Amino acid sequence: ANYPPNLWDYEFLQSLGDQCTVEEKHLKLADKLKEEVKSLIKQTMEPLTKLEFIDTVRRLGLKYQFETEVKEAVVMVSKYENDAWWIDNLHATSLRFRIMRENGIFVPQDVFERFKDTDGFKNQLCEDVKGLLSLYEASFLGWEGEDILDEARTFATSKLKSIEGKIPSPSLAKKVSHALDLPLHWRTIRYEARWFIDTYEEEEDVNLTLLRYAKLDFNIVQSFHQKEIGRLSRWWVGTGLDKMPFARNGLIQSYMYAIGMLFEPNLGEVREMEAKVGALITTIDDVYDVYGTMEELELFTDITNRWDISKADQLPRNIRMPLLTMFNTSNDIGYWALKERGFNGIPCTAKVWSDQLKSYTKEAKWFHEGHKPTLEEYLDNALVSIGFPNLLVTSYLLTVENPTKEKLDYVNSLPLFVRASCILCRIINDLGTSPDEMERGDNLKSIQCYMNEAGASQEVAREHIEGLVRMWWKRLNKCLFEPSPFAEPFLSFTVNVVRGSHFFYQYAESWTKKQGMSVLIHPIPLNE
Amino acid sequence: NYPPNLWDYEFLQSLGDQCTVEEKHLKLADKLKEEVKSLIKQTMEPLTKLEFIDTVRRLGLKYQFETEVKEAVVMVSKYENDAWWIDNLHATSLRFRIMRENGIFVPQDVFERFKDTDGFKNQLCEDVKGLLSLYEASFLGWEGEDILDEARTFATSKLKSIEGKIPSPSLAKKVSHALDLPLHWRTIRYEARWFIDTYEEEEDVNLTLLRYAKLDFNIVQSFHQKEIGRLSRWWVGTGLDKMPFNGLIQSYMYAIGMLFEPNLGEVREMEAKVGALITTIDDVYDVYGTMEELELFTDITNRWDISKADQLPRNIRMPLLTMFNTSNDIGYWALKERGFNGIPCTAKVWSDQLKSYTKEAKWFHEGHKPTLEEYLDNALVSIGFPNLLVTSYLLTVENPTKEKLDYVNSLPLFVRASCILCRIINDLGTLKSIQCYMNEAGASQEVAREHIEGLVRMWWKRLNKCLFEPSPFAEPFLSFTVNVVRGSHFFYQYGDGYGNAESWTKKQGMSVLIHPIPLN
């Protein structure tokens, strides 16, 4: 074991692979239930009922198993000729608006106009909570310049808040509270699936076959995750970085975040590699922040820049081991791209690490010189220092068809889609900082930077930063309606890192542990 | 289904799941170990004692009982009365070998009772046991111990003469086996599997010992299968299994000869990786790469700078980057575990290996014939055992330093002797050794070969004497350096890669790594 102790001991994590083996009879039941659920997605339903069903499928974390059928269902609903089923119905209108836009089918914000009067949304809509929640959730699919969706968000938030915690109807109470914490659009797929499996079971309209399949598929996917954490744990203990006197829970936390970025079994290898990079980002961040002197870090940065480990022995052991693990892992990842994808990715991985440590160095220079950057000067560097250019460009290297230097240079040039994602991850992380640490006047975080600029208060500045999150999400949403040159799975990665940030930096140990226990460690009890 | 293919990495990657040992039988192995400990310690006649610990050794169990075996051998050597071995050819011969094996000197003159000035008395020709014990004991001799040379050539002729004629089942098995290879030249782990089957035929088999030998061998086997899964997964991850030039699995089979113990697992895996890369890159240099490609590969290696790797085509770049990445890994393991960054050392032994290859391709195109001395100077490096042994020293020496690593890499006698032996045993087994010396004072194939076999015996005597002499070296590297040679003896006889040689190798593979031993 390690001291200080990690969330779980590594031998435990390695034990999980065979502790939770899914019995062969459950594997065969899963294939059988999959076909039954396909049939259900395909079956004629009233259009609202079909949208509700495919919303449930998504929410249960199953869209990846039914991509063809869900899309085909959505298209069908977009072609249903008579609109009387949603017109003047706030829930149906909202749900349709959201499901259509999630699937690349435009619906104008004007569909909501009829729910307003001269002064704004009609106060009487507060008599229908399901309606309000669907409007709230739909509002997050909005784009810049869509003022009615901003009004919808403000109205629905306010009305739902006037009842959060006091709703005498258990499943809706739960869903509203959950939504006010984070909208569905901002949550991770995989962690939402585990929460919603429990919520769905308690709802009035539960389909037991869908529910049964959701639990079974959850456990099967979980068994792939458990094998991955076994492999990653063995790797991590092999690096010796578990014994550095910093970066407690680095590996496990990186892996838990990676599951938010991409959970699908068929992306296991990519997910392992992203988890290794994230554990090294966590470790090296600590090296730069809470261990190395300015002279040690200058040499760390120079070795990385030049990809030349000749002078590595000038660094003390606890700095040298992270350095050489970064080097060895980056070479391994670049090599996988050569072996698997036909393209040598070492220049790419070396480059994003060099860019990242240059950004750490800039922050350190500001901190030591007492520089107070503007928000815009801070974010241009801090969107690099958060590590998502590194993680995203790496993800692109490992998945793009026919990778080339020119394609990698393009992604690393931060096209709007990627820039929005990295800025979001940075600002979201900064917003997660509790005011216990704010009182410490760290000038190199978003809120404080804006406070310093404008002479604004902490509350006004926080509100400003929160507004930036909503703005960059609007840009992300619109980028998906013209995403070229990007394709799946990179389009999903770019969005899902943001969701990971929202989920893991909500504005801590126990909460993390709870999430890891339900998603990675404990299977769902089946009654089969 | 269909025959499990030892060459199929699909199959190999799955091992570490199958052939479990029941947690039941672990506990019985702890219990029989303690029974076997008392067996080794309980007073017996000095002869019964030596036979008992030789047996333990050949069952491959000495590593479990090193203190009890040493103290047993030391008690025998202090036994004041010599009547139990004097004039007994078996007893004299076993005492000689087991004492020398444990670093206690016995003079070649303990065999004077069996000889006169005309040599060994031809009357010993039907004492088969004594002739066999004499034969096995002879390979413990040093240079200039001539009574020991005479012993060998004499025992060898007399045992050859009675082979069809031996009644005892276990002894006829043992004589046949010894005439192919003496015990001293065989690997510990592959011999242990063979001997379990033979020992069970012996009149004097101790069923406690036999039962513990089988159960330990299966437990150990389970450690190895997990090792092979991991290594095969690695190999497939490199993509080098799909290059057009068995690789990993063979390297691993050799390494089990160099070291088999569960407690040395990590070192064994790294040695196997290097083993696999040596064979791979030797083929890159020998056949596949152009001249210009080999000079970039060489340059990249010398400067440990992969900036220009992209000028190599795929099938050259992959071995190079794999060599680089794995050398970085092994060097790093030394930092993590041993406190010493070993990347400069692994980069250097690789840079030397490649020159090795640059030299023997120059001698091919440049139409130069070397003296056997000049060729072995290079061929003891190209065989790759400096790489492998310097790496094994890096990973196991107490308090490693650059200075200690520069000394092992200078190749002092003990190391130089193992390395020459590995290259010579290889050339015997096929600008080779024999083909070079032929091109010395101008000899035949028959007289060359005999001269080479002679060199094998000579270097073994020098190795043997080193183990008695002052040395900066300790265990386990002492064992690694002798045991590579044994690995060479055992596998180079059948290296051909088709026909009888491949089915023999496959069978060793299957009996020692795959198939557990049937228990009770």
Side-chain angles (χ1 to χ4, degrees), chain B residues 16-30:
Chain B
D17 281 293
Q18 286 210 354
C19 313
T20 339
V21 163
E22 299 123 305
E23 38 194 281
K24 322 299 97 172
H25 287 189
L26 274 341
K27 194 169 71 93
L28 174 69
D30 292 324

PDB file of all heavy atoms in Angstrom, chain B residues 16-30:
ATOM      1  N   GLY B  16      -1.533 -17.107 -18.248  1.00  0.00           N
ATOM      2  CA  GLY B  16      -1.627 -16.305 -17.039  1.00  0.00           C
ATOM      3  C   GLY B  16      -3.046 -16.319 -16.509  1.00  0.00           C
ATOM      4  O   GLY B  16      -3.302 -15.864 -15.399  1.00  0.00           O
ATOM      5  N   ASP B  17      -3.961 -16.831 -17.337  1.00  0.00           N
ATOM      6  CA  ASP B  17      -5.305 -17.205 -16.903  1.00  0.00           C
ATOM      7  C   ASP B  17      -5.426 -18.718 -16.648  1.00  0.00           C
ATOM      8  O   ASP B  17      -5.941 -19.121 -15.608  1.00  0.00           O
ATOM      9  CB  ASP B  17      -6.338 -16.741 -17.930  1.00  0.00           C
ATOM     10  CG  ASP B  17      -6.663 -15.262 -17.798  1.00  0.00           C
ATOM     11  OD1 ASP B  17      -7.260 -14.885 -16.763  1.00  0.00           O
ATOM     12  OD2 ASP B  17      -6.337 -14.485 -18.728  1.00  0.00           O
ATOM     13  N   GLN B  18      -4.932 -19.543 -17.575  1.00  0.00           N
ATOM     14  CA  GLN B  18      -5.063 -21.014 -17.474  1.00  0.00           C
ATOM     15  C   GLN B  18      -3.923 -21.600 -16.621  1.00  0.00           C
ATOM     16  O   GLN B  18      -2.899 -20.944 -16.399  1.00  0.00           O
ATOM     17  CB  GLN B  18      -5.087 -21.658 -18.867  1.00  0.00           C
ATOM     18  CG  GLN B  18      -6.401 -21.465 -19.619  1.00  0.00           C
ATOM     19  CD  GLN B  18      -6.722 -22.596 -20.569  1.00  0.00           C
ATOM     20  OE1 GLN B  18      -5.929 -23.514 -20.783  1.00  0.00           O
ATOM     21  NE2 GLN B  18      -7.908 -22.540 -21.154  1.00  0.00           N
ATOM     22  N   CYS B  19      -4.131 -22.839 -16.149  1.00  0.00           N
ATOM     23  CA  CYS B  19      -3.157 -23.649 -15.362  1.00  0.00           C
ATOM     24  C   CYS B  19      -2.891 -23.017 -13.985  1.00  0.00           C
ATOM     25  O   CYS B  19      -1.741 -22.927 -13.532  1.00  0.00           O
ATOM     26  CB  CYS B  19      -1.847 -23.857 -16.116  1.00  0.00           C
ATOM     27  SG  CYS B  19      -2.061 -24.374 -17.842  1.00  0.00           S
ATOM     28  N   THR B  20      -3.970 -22.608 -13.318  1.00  0.00           N
ATOM     29  CA  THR B  20      -3.913 -22.101 -11.945  1.00  0.00           C
ATOM     30  C   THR B  20      -3.373 -23.206 -11.032  1.00  0.00           C
ATOM     31  O   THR B  20      -3.521 -24.387 -11.348  1.00  0.00           O
ATOM     32  CB  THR B  20      -5.299 -21.649 -11.451  1.00  0.00           C
ATOM     33  OG1 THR B  20      -6.132 -21.399 -12.583  1.00  0.00           O
ATOM     34  CG2 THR B  20      -5.264 -20.417 -10.570  1.00  0.00           C
ATOM     35  N   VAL B  21      -2.751 -22.828  -9.917  1.00  0.00           N
ATOM     36  CA  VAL B  21      -2.525 -23.782  -8.825  1.00  0.00           C
ATOM     37  C   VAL B  21      -3.553 -23.485  -7.729  1.00  0.00           C
ATOM     38  O   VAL B  21      -3.685 -22.334  -7.284  1.00  0.00           O
ATOM     39  CB  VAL B  21      -1.086 -23.743  -8.274  1.00  0.00           C
ATOM     40  CG1 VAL B  21      -0.983 -24.410  -6.901  1.00  0.00           C
ATOM     41  CG2 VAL B  21      -0.100 -24.367  -9.253  1.00  0.00           C
ATOM     42  N   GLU B  22      -4.264 -24.526  -7.304  1.00  0.00           N
ATOM     43  CA  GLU B  22      -5.280 -24.355  -6.284  1.00  0.00           C
ATOM     44  C   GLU B  22      -4.605 -23.773  -5.037  1.00  0.00           C
ATOM     45  O   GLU B  22      -3.565 -24.283  -4.595  1.00  0.00           O
ATOM     46  CB  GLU B  22      -5.974 -25.682  -5.968  1.00  0.00           C
ATOM     47  CG  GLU B  22      -6.693 -26.314  -7.148  1.00  0.00           C
ATOM     48  CD  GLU B  22      -6.233 -27.726  -7.468  1.00  0.00           C
ATOM     49  OE1 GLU B  22      -5.017 -27.916  -7.672  1.00  0.00           O
ATOM     50  OE2 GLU B  22      -7.084 -28.631  -7.508  1.00  0.00           O
ATOM     51  N   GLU B  23      -5.171 -22.689  -4.508  1.00  0.00           N
ATOM     52  CA  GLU B  23      -4.810 -22.187  -3.164  1.00  0.00           C
ATOM     53  C   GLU B  23      -4.717 -23.361  -2.172  1.00  0.00           C
ATOM     54  O   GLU B  23      -3.980 -23.280  -1.189  1.00  0.00           O
ATOM     55  CB  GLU B  23      -5.775 -21.090  -2.683  1.00  0.00           C
ATOM     56  CG  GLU B  23      -7.244 -21.295  -3.048  1.00  0.00           C
ATOM     57  CD  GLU B  23      -8.134 -20.068  -2.881  1.00  0.00           C
ATOM     58  OE1 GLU B  23      -8.536 -19.772  -1.736  1.00  0.00           O
ATOM     59  OE2 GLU B  23      -8.433 -19.415  -3.899  1.00  0.00           O
ATOM     60  N   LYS B  24      -5.446 -24.448  -2.436  1.00  0.00           N
ATOM     61  CA  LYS B  24      -5.311 -25.703  -1.675  1.00  0.00           C
ATOM     62  C   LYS B  24      -3.837 -26.138  -1.673  1.00  0.00           C
ATOM     63  O   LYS B  24      -3.257 -26.384  -0.615  1.00  0.00           O
ATOM     64  CB  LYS B  24      -6.146 -26.851  -2.267  1.00  0.00           C
ATOM     65  CG  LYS B  24      -7.529 -26.515  -2.821  1.00  0.00           C
ATOM     66  CD  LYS B  24      -8.505 -25.931  -1.816  1.00  0.00           C
ATOM     67  CE  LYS B  24      -8.586 -24.418  -1.855  1.00  0.00           C
ATOM     68  NZ  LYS B  24      -9.674 -23.895  -0.995  1.00  0.00           N
ATOM     69  N   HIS B  25      -3.246 -26.202  -2.869  1.00  0.00           N
ATOM     70  CA  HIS B  25      -1.979 -26.899  -3.098  1.00  0.00           C
ATOM     71  C   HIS B  25      -0.781 -25.995  -2.771  1.00  0.00           C
ATOM     72  O   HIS B  25       0.303 -26.505  -2.477  1.00  0.00           O
ATOM     73  CB  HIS B  25      -1.952 -27.453  -4.527  1.00  0.00           C
ATOM     74  CG  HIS B  25      -2.851 -28.628  -4.717  1.00  0.00           C
ATOM     75  ND1 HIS B  25      -2.838 -29.391  -5.870  1.00  0.00           N
ATOM     76  CD2 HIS B  25      -3.766 -29.192  -3.897  1.00  0.00           C
ATOM     77  CE1 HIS B  25      -3.722 -30.363  -5.760  1.00  0.00           C
ATOM     78  NE2 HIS B  25      -4.300 -30.267  -4.553  1.00  0.00           N
ATOM     79  N   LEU B  26      -0.964 -24.677  -2.820  1.00  0.00           N
ATOM     80  CA  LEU B  26       0.007 -23.761  -2.214  1.00  0.00           C
ATOM     81  C   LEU B  26       0.327 -24.232  -0.788  1.00  0.00           C
ATOM     82  O   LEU B  26       1.483 -24.482  -0.433  1.00  0.00           O
ATOM     83  CB  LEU B  26      -0.563 -22.335  -2.182  1.00  0.00           C
ATOM     84  CG  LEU B  26      -0.370 -21.454  -3.424  1.00  0.00           C
ATOM     85  CD1 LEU B  26       0.748 -21.946  -4.338  1.00  0.00           C
ATOM     86  CD2 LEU B  26      -1.662 -21.316  -4.213  1.00  0.00           C
ATOM     87  N   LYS B  27      -0.719 -24.362   0.019  1.00  0.00           N
ATOM     88  CA  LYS B  27      -0.595 -24.651   1.442  1.00  0.00           C
ATOM     89  C   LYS B  27       0.117 -26.000   1.632  1.00  0.00           C
ATOM     90  O   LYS B  27       0.957 -26.122   2.520  1.00  0.00           O
ATOM     91  CB  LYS B  27      -1.987 -24.624   2.087  1.00  0.00           C
ATOM     92  CG  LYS B  27      -2.022 -24.576   3.610  1.00  0.00           C
ATOM     93  CD  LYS B  27      -3.411 -24.289   4.169  1.00  0.00           C
ATOM     94  CE  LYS B  27      -4.392 -25.437   4.013  1.00  0.00           C
ATOM     95  NZ  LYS B  27      -4.423 -26.313   5.210  1.00  0.00           N
ATOM     96  N   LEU B  28      -0.197 -26.997   0.798  1.00  0.00           N
ATOM     97  CA  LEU B  28       0.491 -28.290   0.859  1.00  0.00           C
ATOM     98  C   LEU B  28       1.966 -28.143   0.447  1.00  0.00           C
ATOM     99  O   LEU B  28       2.813 -28.906   0.924  1.00  0.00           O
ATOM    100  CB  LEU B  28      -0.208 -29.307  -0.045  1.00  0.00           C
ATOM    101  CG  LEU B  28       0.522 -30.645  -0.152  1.00  0.00           C
ATOM    102  CD1 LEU B  28       0.468 -31.397   1.169  1.00  0.00           C
ATOM    103  CD2 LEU B  28      -0.026 -31.499  -1.282  1.00  0.00           C
ATOM    104  N   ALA B  29       2.271 -27.197  -0.440  1.00  0.00           N
ATOM    105  CA  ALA B  29       3.653 -26.938  -0.871  1.00  0.00           C
ATOM    106  C   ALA B  29       4.455 -26.314   0.278  1.00  0.00           C
ATOM    107  O   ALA B  29       5.642 -26.597   0.420  1.00  0.00           O
ATOM    108  CB  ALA B  29       3.664 -26.038  -2.092  1.00  0.00           C
ATOM    109  N   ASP B  30       3.821 -25.449   1.078  1.00  0.00           N
ATOM    110  CA  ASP B  30       4.474 -24.881   2.284  1.00  0.00           C
ATOM    111  C   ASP B  30       4.825 -26.017   3.274  1.00  0.00           C
ATOM    112  O   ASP B  30       5.891 -26.001   3.895  1.00  0.00           O
ATOM    113  CB  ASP B  30       3.559 -23.882   3.013  1.00  0.00           C
ATOM    114  CG  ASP B  30       3.312 -22.594   2.227  1.00  0.00           C
ATOM    115  OD1 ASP B  30       4.235 -22.105   1.531  1.00  0.00           O
ATOM    116  OD2 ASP B  30       2.182 -22.048   2.338  1.00  0.00           O
TER     117      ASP B  30
END
